[PDB]
Structures are given as structure tokens and as C-alpha cells.
Amino acid sequence: ERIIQQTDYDALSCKLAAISVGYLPSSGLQRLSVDLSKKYTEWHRSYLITLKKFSRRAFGKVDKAMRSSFPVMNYGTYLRTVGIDAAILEFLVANEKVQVVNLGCGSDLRMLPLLQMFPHLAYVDIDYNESVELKNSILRESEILRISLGLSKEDTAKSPFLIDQGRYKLAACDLNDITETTRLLDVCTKREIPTIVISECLLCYMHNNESQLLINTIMSKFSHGLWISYDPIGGSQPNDRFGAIMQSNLKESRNLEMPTLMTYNSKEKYASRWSAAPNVIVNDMWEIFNAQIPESERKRLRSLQFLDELEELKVMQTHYILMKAQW
Ligand SMILES: Nc1ncnc2c1ncn2[C@@H]1O[C@H](CSCC[C@H](N)C(=O)O)[C@@H](O)[C@H]1O
């Protein structure tokens, strides 16, 4: 569905706006060296320039969303990124030979530093065909992104892969299709390798059956791993209209659905979807802001923009969660 696929333009605008202002990279929390901090920005900057080459319409959407970002959104984007990153880094530091499967990867570039930083990491990006065709175009067209992946400019990979360049694979898959998904995994992952699964604003676009099948099945495919999921929740307090508001706004604006926003309207209900994993941690992004963000970062963020409305931040961030499931 082309509607769902374009929710990536929102995710990308947000990523890009946070880098522009200077929220990211956070070299401390993302564990970026001097050169990788520089590259982080340079890679995202080229990604936007190269997107422009491939799609005027895409670029215009991304561009206007960036210009109109507000501090509360940049804090959210920062929290989302460092929170996932912190979960990933802890596991990769502890587990040398690891595979990362990034489900609904959109324009995510976290592989670029991760692959450098962790010599024995293998990483697999998975999104709809149309989305991964565009990502493959940008990655190969841009000289700096090609170099970062050791890629050639001529797409030289065999279906099911658009990129199959050593420790990185970019592959198309409809994740509503469990058989296509498990088939795809059989040829790019191994059962016995500690596996991190990332679903960052992916499951929110899925019907409960499809998302629960995908959760169960993927967890069953690997002896051990960690699922890191980030998503909104509709919110459980009485008279909390966040979910209601969000669903209505997406249906009127984009014809877009978030089928289980109200079903998983709190962190505990959300986390319960990984009840097969022995170790489930769940926090809303406000809790992350208070628990994981050092005072040095809080001070560095204040230097960049005026967050005049901290309570507005808190309200939004209590409606996003980071779930960590380990088996
Ligand atoms: N059924 C499905 N199969 C594969 N990709 C899907 C999918 N449903 C949604 N997606 C992908 O999920 C992404 C959500 S936008 C999130 C992008 C990225 N994970 C980030 O946080 O920046 C879009 O790229 C969309 O195409």
C-alpha cells in the first residue's frame, strides 16, 4: 500500500530535521566516533540530496516537513533514535556475531555506522518492494553512501535482494505475508545467531493478526535475540483522546490506518504481545527521557532550540513506547 509506504517521508523528515538542528548525532548515546559523527550527518544530507534526484514529489514532502518541524517533534525524534540505539548497542557490545533484521526499515541509516562499528554484524533491511527500490536507488547513486556499504553503482544483486553486499542486505517483502517473510529470512539469516529485530513504527500499520503472527514467527525462528519495538499507543487514561485524535486525523488526512492503536493503548498491553519472550521491558518515551538522557544531553539539547512547552513534550512522549523483548 502506497499510503503506508509514504509514512516513511514523515519518518525521514523527522530524522533529517533533528540532524539539521543538531539533536543527532548524539555521539555519546549513539557511541559514534569523531569520523562516524561527521559521517552520520553527511550520509543523511546526501540521502536527502539523492532523494531529490529520484523524486521531486518525495523530496518536496520531506523538505516541507523538515522546515516545519517544531522542537517537541525533534525531542521525540531524538528520543526514538537514541533509545533504540542504546538498546541495540548494548546487545552488539555483548554479542560480537549478531544479525539485525530491520522490519519496515523505510530510509533508516543506522546500518551505516553499525556495520562499521561492529565487524561481525550482519544487517538485513526489509520493506515493501517500492520502498526498497527507492532506498536501493539512493544508496547506489550517492557516492558517499555507496562507499559506506562497499557498493557498486550497477545493481548487481539477485532477487530476493536489491543489495547483497557482504554484511548488508536490502530486501523487498510484504510483512503482512508470513510465508514470503519466513522464506526471505531463511535465505538471509541463521537460527543459531543472536538476532536483533527492529520494528520502528512498523507494527502500528498492521492488523493484529498479521503483527501477532509476525512477532510469534520471527521470535520462533531464532534461538536467541532481542526485539526492539517503537510505536505510538492510543493511551489508557480516561478522557485521553490522543489515540482517537490520531486515528481520525490519519483517516481524514491520508486515508491511513493504525488498526491497533486503541487496542494497545498502554505500554503494558503493548508489551503483552511479546509475552512468549521470558524478558520483556517496556517504557514510554517520557520515562526514557528521564531515565536514559544524561543531564549533559539535556543541556546540549536546550542550547539548540527553545522547548518552551515541556508538558506538551511529556504528553506526546507518554504516547510512544520502546518495547524490549529478549529470549
Ligand atoms: N506490510 C509491510 N511490509 C513491509 N514494510 C512495511 C509494511 N507495512 C509498513 N511497512 C513500512 O513501514 C515503514 C513505516 S515508516 C517507518 C520507517 C523506519 N522504520 C523509521 O522509523 O524511520 C514504511 O517504510 C512502510 O513501508
Residues 61/40, Cβ–Cβ less than 8 Å: no
Is 200 marked as binding a ligand? yes
Q: Residue 199 in 3-state DSSP?
A: strand
**Which range of residues forms the domain containing residue 92?**
1-327
Listed residue (196, 189, 111) closest to 150, CA to CA: 111
CATH of the domain at 165: 3.40.50.150
Residues 219/314, Cβ–Cβ less than 8 Å: no
d(CA 227, CA 219): 8
Q: Does 86 contact ligand 1 (Cβ within 6 A)?
A: no
Pairing of strands 121-127, 195-200: unpaired
Is 28 marked as binding a ligand? no
Q: Kindly provide the resolution of this structure in angstroms, with one decimal.
A: 1.9
What is the experimental method?
A: X-ray
Query: What stretch of H or E contains 170?
Result: strand 168-172
The structural domain count of the chain equals 1
Q: Does 128 contact ligand 1 (Cβ within 6 A)?
A: yes
Listed residue (172, 218, 220, 179) closest to 199, CA to CA: 218
- Non-local (6+) Cβ contacts of 39 within 8 A are 112, 113, 144, 148
State the distance from the centre of ligand 1 to the C-alpha of 18, rounded, in angstroms: 20
Q: What is the largest CA-CA distance in the chain?
A: 55
Give the residues across from 228 on adjacent strands: 198, 324
Question: Which phi and psi angles does 199 have, rounded to 5°?
Answer: -130, 100
Query: What stretch of H or E contains 54?
Result: helix 34-54
Give the residues across from 165 on adjacent strands: 168
Q: Does 134 contact ligand 1 (Cβ within 6 A)?
A: no
Q: Residue 287 in 3-state DSSP?
A: helix
Q: Residue 157 in 3-state DSSP?
A: coil
Residues 62/12, Cβ–Cβ less than 8 Å: yes
Residues 324/197, Cβ–Cβ less than 8 Å: no
Residues 103/131, Cβ–Cβ less than 8 Å: no
Residues 237/208, Cβ–Cβ less than 8 Å: no
Residues 155/56, Cβ–Cβ less than 8 Å: no
Question: Which phi and psi angles does 321 have, rounded to 5°?
Answer: -135, 160
Is 151 marked as binding a ligand? no
Q: Which atom of ligand 1 is nearest to the CA of 106?
A: 24
Is 284 marked as binding a ligand? no
State the distance from the centre of ligand 1 to the C-alpha of 308, rounded, in angstroms: 32
d(CA 257, CA 210): 14
d(CA 183, CA 87): 27
Sign of CA dihedral 89, 278, 284, 288: negative
d(CA 88, CA 91): 5
What are the Cα distances from residue 320, in Å, to 4, 21, 277? 19, 22, 21
State the distance from the centre of ligand 1 to the C-alpha of 97, rounded, in angstroms: 26
State the distance from the centre of ligand 1 to the C-alpha of 131, rounded, in angstroms: 8
- Amino acid, single-letter form, for residue 37: S
- The three grid cell numbers given for residue 96, joined into one nine-digit string: 560480537
Q: Which atom of ligand 1 is nearest to the CA of 15?
A: 22
State the distance from the centre of ligand 1 to the C-alpha of 202, rounded, in angstroms: 5
- Non-local (6+) Cβ contacts of 140 within 8 A are 146, 151, 152, 153, 154, 155, 163
Residues 321/230, Cβ–Cβ less than 8 Å: yes
